[PDB]
Design a protein around this ligand. Sequence first.
Ligand SMILES: [Ca+2]
Ligand SMILES: [Ca+2]
Ligand SMILES: [Cl-]
Ligand SMILES: [Cl-]
Ligand SMILES: [Cl-]
Ligand SMILES: [Cl-]
Ligand SMILES: [Cl-]
Ligand SMILES: [Cl-]
Ligand SMILES: [Zn+2]
Ligand SMILES: [Zn+2]
Ligand SMILES: [Zn+2]
Ligand SMILES: [Zn+2]
Ligand SMILES: [Zn+2]
Ligand SMILES: [Zn+2]
Lengths: 301, 88
Amino acid sequence: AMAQNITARIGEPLVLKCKGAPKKPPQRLEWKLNTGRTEAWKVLSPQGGGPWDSVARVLPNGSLFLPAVGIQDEGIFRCQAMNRNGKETKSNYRVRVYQIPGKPEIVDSASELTAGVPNKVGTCVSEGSYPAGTLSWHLDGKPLVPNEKGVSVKEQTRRHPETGLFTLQSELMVTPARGGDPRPTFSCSFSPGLPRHRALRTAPIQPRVWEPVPLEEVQLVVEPEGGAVAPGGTVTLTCEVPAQPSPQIHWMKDGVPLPLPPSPVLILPEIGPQDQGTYSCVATHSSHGPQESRAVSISII
Amino acid sequence: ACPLDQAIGLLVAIFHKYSGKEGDKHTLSKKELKELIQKELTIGSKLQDAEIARLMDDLDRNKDQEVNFQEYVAFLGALALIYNEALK
Ligand SMILES: [Ca+2]
Ligand SMILES: [Ca+2]
Ligand SMILES: [Cl-]
Ligand SMILES: [Cl-]
Ligand SMILES: [Cl-]
Ligand SMILES: [Cl-]
Ligand SMILES: [Cl-]
Ligand SMILES: [Cl-]
Ligand SMILES: [Zn+2]
Ligand SMILES: [Zn+2]
Ligand SMILES: [Zn+2]
Ligand SMILES: [Zn+2]
Ligand SMILES: [Zn+2]
Ligand SMILES: [Zn+2]
């Protein structure tokens, strides 16, 4: 292109060369610019104390000097110069600015994820960028692409009117599959939109995954766990119905209700071969169909 | 497939198998912890009741009578090196 692209850091000095200009007077040169500040084409006079002299000043060599460039200085800068040969030279610049935010952080991260359901892993936050830029996630050292699974991201971009700088947020949500990696490792990174620059990365986090046992409506535990016992001695059967305050529990052997009153517990002491069989409990409720616990096989050896 | 994924998956499951019995479902009471030690761990078969009580007290660093996952990880860490010497 004719226009040379200039990329400058916010808050830093910038010098724009007026090519083909004599180094000392006499100089036939003129700067014309159009920036966020002017909202129009303006001649930038070389004399001291001009309208813009706290922001942009022409140097003795004809170069344009900006002590501390800002977002509003983005725009077009043109110099038309004349050598001592009568040689006509033009310089055309397009100025864009940038700022690199501080290192991104993951806030409110989860120590433990629950397999089988959505979890908020954490929220990546980036403060003080221009232009906006973007946040992305890594998983086990590889890029994590959204909306596969189970995996989703809630993103937002916010501009601070007092500085023109951006705050970025990326909230990561995952649904870990049962049988998966019990310690997935995540990290987030910020990619500047300008200039070309290394990604800034958070320290990684490694939440553990807990796989909840499937919840039975009627729960049966047997001590000892096996339901296998030496001759003589005891087995105790215990029944629980979490969703009911006052459950009515009826014990069964081999699919047939035992001639007993309702009770949450059934102890089988002095076990002989005759006590061998499949046991379970049934929770009855008025207006509802009965529910059975898992079947436990009790044997002797 | 990976024995690491497998063992770590196991340690998480074992913790919750006992932590979810009473009280806070994600911490181990003295009751739950003693049962975990005696039932799943090699180091606990030889130990007597007074020894286990001492062990459990030394596993509860903040003295809330509960052993949380962090206190439990530290436990396994020590065990790894204690089991390590015994295997030489
Ligand atoms: Ca508990
Ligand atoms: Ca504790
Ligand atoms: Cl993996
Ligand atoms: Cl993973
Ligand atoms: Cl872990
Ligand atoms: Cl009845
Ligand atoms: Cl190995
Ligand atoms: Cl936990
Ligand atoms: Zn603000
Ligand atoms: Zn993984
Ligand atoms: Zn850079
Ligand atoms: Zn009945
Ligand atoms: Zn492996
Ligand atoms: Zn937990």
